[PDB]
Symmetry: D4
Subunit: 121 residues, 8 copies
């Protein structure tokens, strides 16, 4: 199954980070979320109730990205993956990519991040 639903370049200002200074000042976190979902029925019917509502998916991502400051992006993505997989059965697998385009790293790069793929059980 190669159908997917996606939300790209989502950006939130948060205060997560392992370094105290990080959590104090904050920074923009960019997030790409790709969900595995079979879209033929919804494509057949044309009824939103046959697919996953992205607005709902964005609010779920936002709630975690703009919430309690944690240390790792790995934690930020695991909570997102695990939260989308719970409330949605049509999502067979959730891929969450988080990027810190401006970390406390002395150099010139486009960004540093992680990406996790999590199947729905």
């Amino acid at each position: 199954m190669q159908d997917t639903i996606f939300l790209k370049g989502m950006r939130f200002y948060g205060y997560h980070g392992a370094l105290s200074a990080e959590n104090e000042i904050g920074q923009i976190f960019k997030v790409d979320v790709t969900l595995k979902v079979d879209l033929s029925e919804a494509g057949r019917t044309d009824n939103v109730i046959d697919t996953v509502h992205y607005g709902e998916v964005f609010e779920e991502v936002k709630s975690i990205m703009e919430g309690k400051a944690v240390n790792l992006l790995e934690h930020l993505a695991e909570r997102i993956a695990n939260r989308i997989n719970s409330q949605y059965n049509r999502v067979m697998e959730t891929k969450v990519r988080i990027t810190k385009e401006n970390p406390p790293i002395p150099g010139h790069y486009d960004g540093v991040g992680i990406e996790i793929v999590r199947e729905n059980k």
Copy 2:
């Protein structure tokens, strides 16, 4: 077989959408279409009649994207996939990606959408 024919960043202004307000004002819909086709003969011959005409493929996408307002992008992509697969036998499979870069979602992201892959039967 890894040969493909493609049309990228296609953009149409339509009025599809589940919310009444959406259909009223409208918005730009971006579409990427990738077709699976064996291009060695056409590459051998150099005769357009040995490959698929993209102009024709674009008109087909345009006709659906600028037509009757439907609810889901899933419906918009299924009709595209199913319409390219019918009129072309050299297309072994059609991939349709639709993106709503500016949906009625309160936030900052690059865009939300879907992507369907459909083999030709």
Copy 3:
């Protein structure tokens, strides 16, 4: 005097707009603010108290951009100009540019907007 302080590509999701549908769904408003200020003293001293705090300027723009939905961008910019000019005497003139990159206009363009320049009295 050619010194300036600036905030660029500021983006807020609001519900301003002359059309009912607009105010209902909303959209991203991009704002560029350029303030006329003599920066030699601050450049001489290196004391923030000798210049204008942009954070404060951004909060002021944000408060208006994310507040009560009004009709015109002209109103949105006049309130910004008039609000920065009041609380800051070092600002000799305020330029406010607002852009609706995705208005309810059926077409292909990069964006529509306005720009006002207002001297401090």
Copy 4:
């Protein structure tokens, strides 16, 4: 007076051009329109009837850009300038920039064009 109303990166597919081949195949024409207008009243009132409607301005540009194929971009811009200046008295001056990003010129450049500034009489 430094207030302005603007429409940027407007893009239409037309068939204007001095060379026969040009008019036959066509190409994308990008247009930037900047109008001089005093926006304090509209900024004061918040009444669209105190400013110029861009939708109307875009339709006017579109009608000329997607109409009868002419030779020069200079003609395309003079008709735009002269047409916006007639139907709108609040526009004290109209600036029209047209760009041929892909002309029949053998080389590598970002685009070729013209720009005219026309006061309202």
Copy 5:
């Protein structure tokens, strides 16, 4: 084997095309070439003679892209693939992607093209 050598966004002005008008005026052709090559020896030694010279690969692409005007991009890519695979044994497979960002197609898209993958025999 996942090592690759690549040349991206290569751009040439040519006159290929099925339509007479096309061949007359011309247009920019963008080309991405990705070659499959085992790079551990060259990575071990650091001797250019243990890998494929891209300059040579670019000249080969250029010679075909700026040569005799043909009809299909499929022909343009097959000649490239077949020409790189002949003169280089370390290339186990050649992928050639050609894009017509501005074809004679009346619309708004980022570009139309093809992509062929060809193993070295």
Copy 6:
């Protein structure tokens, strides 16, 4: 008079440069040319013979940019300015901007260059 004719992002690979190594390997030179010309007649008539032919202007720039390797960009721009001003009387003034996006300078920047404005005598 605020009318202008322009050619932007023109790019040529040359070997100009004060350092021997520079002239040996070469580099891409980006050029923006803006000419002052009154376009109302051409806008009135629609006759190319009432304006300046950009193709001709591009060939003139190309001939100098892809010719004999000189030392300074200042020399490269003065020859361009002086060559466009001679063969065209409708050009009241020529502005030439040249950019070395990748000079032998150890650092991270978008580019270094010069810009000359030259009136037609």
Copy 7:
């Protein structure tokens, strides 16, 4: 006199900033420097000794941008302006623009900064 020499998008990682946390972690500072210089002689002669060496100008900017952490960007730009104006007499005026694309400001914008223009005495 409208001739200019320029260095754009220069980027350095520094630790300047009014807030302790800022100086601790650091951030990228983008700098645009535009110098007023008459380039006809250098354009006439083609002798680097008749113009200003940008490499030298970049090293001067770099030395200040990558040096002792100060509070204001206003101080960072005044030292740059004042340092280029001293060692170069052909520079009639120096414009320095500094941008903090990622300041400790909770929001979505492209960047905040200042710009100073300083004549050479």
Copy 8:
């Protein structure tokens, strides 16, 4: 396992290159590094000690990219791969992509490079 840690668009100015002139003047080298790592524990715990520190990974890349000038990018990437795989056991495989956006190649392209994938033994 599809989890990954990444560093993108990393840019260093070096003097590597097979041609003498290259090593003399230098150029910007862009590097993308993608490491295979299982991130569920770190995602579970939220303890940096359960994942790989990118800062450390960037310093390792920087040390090699800004060190002794070598001939091939293949050598530059093999040393990076082999150096990250040694000091980190959680990295099951390292992918290193290096790009020369501005090589001594006479033409117009976006960049030339290589990419190596190396498993950790």
